[PDB]
Design a binder for this molecule. Structure first.
Ligand SMILES: CN(C)c1cc(Cl)c(C(=O)N(Cc2ccccc2)c2ccc(O)c(C(C)(C)C)c2)c(Cl)c1
Ligand SMILES: CN(C)c1cc(Cl)c(C(=O)N(Cc2ccccc2)c2ccc(O)c(C(C)(C)C)c2)c(Cl)c1
Lengths: 218, 210
């Protein structure tokens, strides 16, 4: 069912979605480091710091994103970043040590409980990598973010991706005509989450340089 | 009373020296992040430091960093910034999730060294003297380090006689504060020393440089 052009759109979304790569140093810390509230927080925030970078990269490569007005590009990424990070974080769980660090990191259950139920609801959907990648592009190119001067130009970028995802939900899950709707339902659900804690964190950058002090590069 | 050569040393050292709970924790670790960088640049400028063998340079800075950081935190804390009378930094510390285990001795040390009415020159010389401690683990040439440390102790002991001649205890009190820092538990600070925290809140996310 995909067209050649639909195949190519999908191809370039997958290459840029892959190429995401979490340094082994970060993933090794999860098992090996001390478990204490401060170390746990610094490890989760270092991972999230890697995710923001990957997210911003992925956004800049999205098909047509660079064609948009520069002030609207800023506003689109500002509006979408929290929900896109939430979606990313789910992929990381779907790790038993990672959860125990999250549950003793000083972060309030106010924010941990909704996220963990969200992860379960995502695992139930049996999402392919192709489906994560498309849904991430879709949440990012949302034409209704605040502060967008030209909503129709963002609609033009989003709509081809919505078409491709819908065709993929038909092919891969013919017995479930409600698969596509249920994917979009997860994005609807993220918009209802409390974004305030994530917005407070979104500008912070945490990196472990545990290289001799004397040889460190600033 | 300082010799011309001692004045040359002092002015050089001074020129080199003059270069929610989660949210409070990030702010404090960002400040400390800046302090490590300053401390490392100051160390590289110490007279003679670059002439030491490379492994002894690494050993000195590694073995002395915690103490030098604690001394820098005392200098900042007692300045009560930005006003000279603000309790903001103390309030952030008390609500940052850091345990009383680590806060209590730091506060006790800030009060103790605060009563000595430290000058910047005293801080700069005491930092240099901490870093050039010849007795650290893993130093091969202890005698060369001791030779670098000695003229700084000499300048500092003179500065104490010049500026506090009625308080002959003053140099001894400075050395006793260094023994306190050496004896404090370093485990928490060693855990934090390699972490680097910065708030990139001045650009939109799209324009941030990675
Ligand atoms: C840029 N920084 C330092 C951020 C830190 C966090 Cl915790 C978050 C954040 O709120 N979360 C959501 C979350 C998930 C699980 C429990 C509490 C909060 C976030 C976003 C991406 C992530 O990879 C993670 C981790 C915990 C899975 C690393 C967390 C974000 Cl958005 C940014
Ligand atoms: C490189 N990083 C992120 C460090 C963080 C801290 Cl809290 C510390 C640290 O242990 N202290 C000591 C301390 C002071 C007050 C309460 C608890 C612990 C440290 C070192 C330099 C500092 O500037 C600070 C602050 C609290 C004054 C920012 C703290 C160190 Cl050494 C390094």
């Amino acid at each position: 069912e995909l067209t050649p052009d639909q195949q190519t759109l999908l191809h370039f979304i997958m290459d840029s979605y892959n190429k995401q790569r979490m340094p082994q140093e970060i993933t090794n810390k999860i098992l090996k480091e001390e478990f204490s509230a401060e170390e746990n927080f610094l490890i989760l925030t270092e991972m999230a710091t890697n995710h923001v970078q990957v997210l911003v990269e992925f956004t800049k490569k999205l098909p047509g994103f660079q064609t948009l007005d520069h002030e609207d590009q800023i506003a689109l990424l500002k509006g979408s970043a929290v929900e896109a990070m939430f979606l990313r974080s789910a992929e990381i769980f779907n790790s038993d040590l990672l959860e125990e660090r999250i549950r003793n990191s000083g972060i309030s259950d106010e924010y941990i409980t909704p996220m963990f139920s969200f992860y379960k609801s995502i695992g139930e959907l049996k999402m392919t990598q192709e489906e994560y990648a498309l849904l991430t592009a879709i949440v990012i190119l949302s034409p209704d973010r605040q502060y967008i001067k030209d909503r129709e130009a963002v609609e033009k970028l989003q709509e081809p991706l919505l078409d491709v995802l819908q065709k993929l939900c038909k092919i891969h899950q013919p017995e479930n005509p409600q698969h596509f709707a249920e994917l979009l339902g997860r994005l609807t659900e993220l918009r209802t989450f409390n974004h305030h804690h994530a917005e407070m964190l979104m500008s912070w950058r945490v990196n472990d340089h545990k290289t001799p002090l004397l040889e460190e590069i600033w």
